[PDB]
Amino acid sequence: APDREKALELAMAQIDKNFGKGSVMRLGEEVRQPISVIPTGSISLDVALGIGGLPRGRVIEIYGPESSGKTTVALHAVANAQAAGGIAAFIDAEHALDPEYAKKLGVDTDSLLVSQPDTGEQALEIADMLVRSGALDIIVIDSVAALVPRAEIEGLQARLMSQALRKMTGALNNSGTTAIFINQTGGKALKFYASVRLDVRRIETLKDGTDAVGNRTRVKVVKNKVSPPFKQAEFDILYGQGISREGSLIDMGVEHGFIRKSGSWFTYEGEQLGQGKENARKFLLENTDVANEIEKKIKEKLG
Ligand SMILES: Nc1ncnc2c1ncn2[C@@H]1O[C@H](COP(=O)(O)OP(=O)(O)O)[C@@H](O)[C@H]1O
Incomplete structure (x- = not known):
């Protein structure tokens, strides 16, 4: 009876050693519990993440059709890790941030580091050497898609990423700065480096007697290297007011x-x-x- 599993774990055990932690999991384990994590403003999603928030030091990908919540979750992410001492950096490439909103959520904008790069390349360095300072707790890059390389502005993108991601996934692991990317294109890379991948989609249009208070959003944790994946959560997003x-x-x-x-x-x-x-x-x-x-x-x- 035991010999079977008594070996699975010897194996399963060396797997971690040679490759990592969440290399081989039991979708049923309650396993682990780190003392570093950033709430996301959704208790629902935190218990879904399996560690009560976004792991610090990892790269996070949050994708989904427009206007479904990604950045809203991200601004909260910021809101939190910011109210807790550390500071956040936001590398803009979409040029569509609303501070009055980021603020309601809870961001201390006046002390938020925003960067409006020119090349998708210049962007990843500003994001790189910035993370290296070992000062930022969380950094978010808005739109993995809006990161065009110098050439196109003047295949190379998923390389830009591949490149940047290797050279950047490193520091992050020392630095301790968790990093967020918004998607909808250069995939591959991020689709692998990501330690966590959230799939966010809108399920309903929150009716409030009148016409609408917000939207019921659903998040599916397709990739979770810090606990079992696939668990999912839903929450509401009040028009200009947040989760x-x-x-x-x-x-x-x-x-x-x-x-x-x-x-x-x-x-x-x-x-x-x-x-x-x-x-x-x-x-x-x-x-x-x-x-x-x-x-x-x-x-x-x-x-
Ligand atoms: N400045 C704002 N005022 C009101 N609602 C907003 C604002 N910004 C975002 N939202 C809400 O967030 C939803 C989309 O999320 P974000 O805007 O998070 O898009 P992604 O989902 O990031 O494109 C919108 O449908 C809206 O309900």
Whole structure:
């Protein structure tokens, strides 16, 4: 009975040694637990990431059809690792950032390092030597696609990446700076260097009695080298306001039973919150105490 597995692990064990950590996993393991991670503003996605947030030191890829949430998740990423001392750098190539928004989310823009490169090449160096300073915690490159090499501006892209990614995946691992890339093209590279790959797509248009409060987004963790992959999460994005914390709690809060649905009436053990997800949201919105409790308990029911 044991000889079988008693060898799988001897093997499986040397596999890690020779190649890494998450080289060979059990989609069922609760395994590991690092003390470095950046929340993403979605408890739903954090437990989905398996480590409660984006691993620091790794390269992260977040792709999906336009207007489905990538950058929103990224700005929060920033918001967090920034509220926690470290600073973030944003290498712009799309030229479509809205600070008033990045701000609401929680970014301290006035102290955010933005760079508007000219070549896709110049961009990866500014991003390279910048990460080497060992100062940035998180850096985000907006659009793996908008990174044209000098030639085209004056095949070579997926090389530009290949090149840059090797020379850059290195430092990152020393530096400890986690890096984010937004996609929709030069793939291959990133599709491998990535330690984590999030697939973000929009599932519904959040109706709010009126016409719309936001969008229900779904993320699928297609690649996870820091824990088991394939787990997925969904959350809401309120038009110009961001990933609804609270709303993320109702859902997580009932899919774990700390919140009961007695027929559209969300109740938190005994006492009611409201009637209609958006109403209970409201309750949670203006009730931080109770809120933090669910989060707290939700957070203790998992890790
Ligand atoms: N400045 C803004 N004002 C209002 N809503 C915004 C703003 N920026 C982003 N959003 C919301 O984010 C959604 C798309 O996410 P981002 O805008 O994250 O796109 P990606 O999904 O990054 O293209 C939009 O449909 C919208 O609901």
